[PDB]
Amino acid sequence: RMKQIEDKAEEILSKLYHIENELARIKKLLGE
Amino acid sequence: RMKQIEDKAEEILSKLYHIENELARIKKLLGER
Amino acid sequence: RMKQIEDKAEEILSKLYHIENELARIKKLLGE
Amino acid sequence: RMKQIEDKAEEILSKLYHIENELARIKKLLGER
Numbered sequence: 001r002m003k004q005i006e007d008k009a010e011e012i013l014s015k016l017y018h019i020e021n022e023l024a025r026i027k028k029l030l031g032e
Numbered sequence: 033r034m035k036q037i038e039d040k041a042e043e044i045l046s047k048l049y050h051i052e053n054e055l056a057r058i059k060k061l062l063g064e065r
Numbered sequence: 066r067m068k069q070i071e072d073k074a075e076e077i078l079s080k081l082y083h084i085e086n087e088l089a090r091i092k093k094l095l096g097e
Numbered sequence: 098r099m100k101q102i103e104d105k106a107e108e109i110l111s112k113l114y115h116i117e118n119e120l121a122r123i124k125k126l127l128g129e130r
Contacts, residue, residue, distance in 0.1 A: 005070060006098045008041045009105040012077070015048040016112040022055040023119045029062040030126060033071045040074040047081040054088045061095060073106045080113040087120040094127040 002102075003098065005037060005041075006102055006105065008038070009102060009109065012041075012044060012048070012109055013105060013112065015045070015052065016109060016116065019048075019052055019055065019116055020112070020119075022052065022059060023116065023123075026055065026059050026062065026123070027119070029059065029064075030123065032122075032126075033068065037067075037071055037074060040071065040078060044074065044077055044081060047078065047085070051081065051084055051088065054085075054092070057097075058088075058091070058095065061097075070102060070106075073103070077106075077109060077113070080110070080117065084113075084117055084120065087117065087124060091120065091124050091127065094124065094129075
């Protein structure tokens with residue numbers, strides 16, 4: 001009930017990791 | 033709060049898709065670019 | 066108690082808006 | 098959960114500072130770049 005807030009939280013974390021992979025690709029296309 | 037927490041969770045998710053999609057566009061622009 | 070989870074949530078939203086301003090600057094430096 | 102929710106909130110924040118800082122570095126690289 002709460003348990004559901006946590007689920008949301010997990011889901012959030014997961015988009016942030018996907019954002020990190022995007023930036024890893026962008027960084028290389030530039031030349032970091 | 034609660035009705036409230038899940039209103040903020042949605043704005044957050046919704047913001048997160050907007051960010052992923054701006055990043056996807058930039059990545060595709062380089063490529064090239 | 067919960068009330069504190071909301072506070073966190075607000076804080077999260079706020080970094081996402083700051084990320085959006087960063088990307089607005091990056092987009093212009095490129096030429097979107 | 099709770100002990101738990103605020104463990105996930107922290108990882109999330111911590112991830113969010115990492116993202117802001119990668120973006121800041123990219124922005125500074127262009128500039129230029």
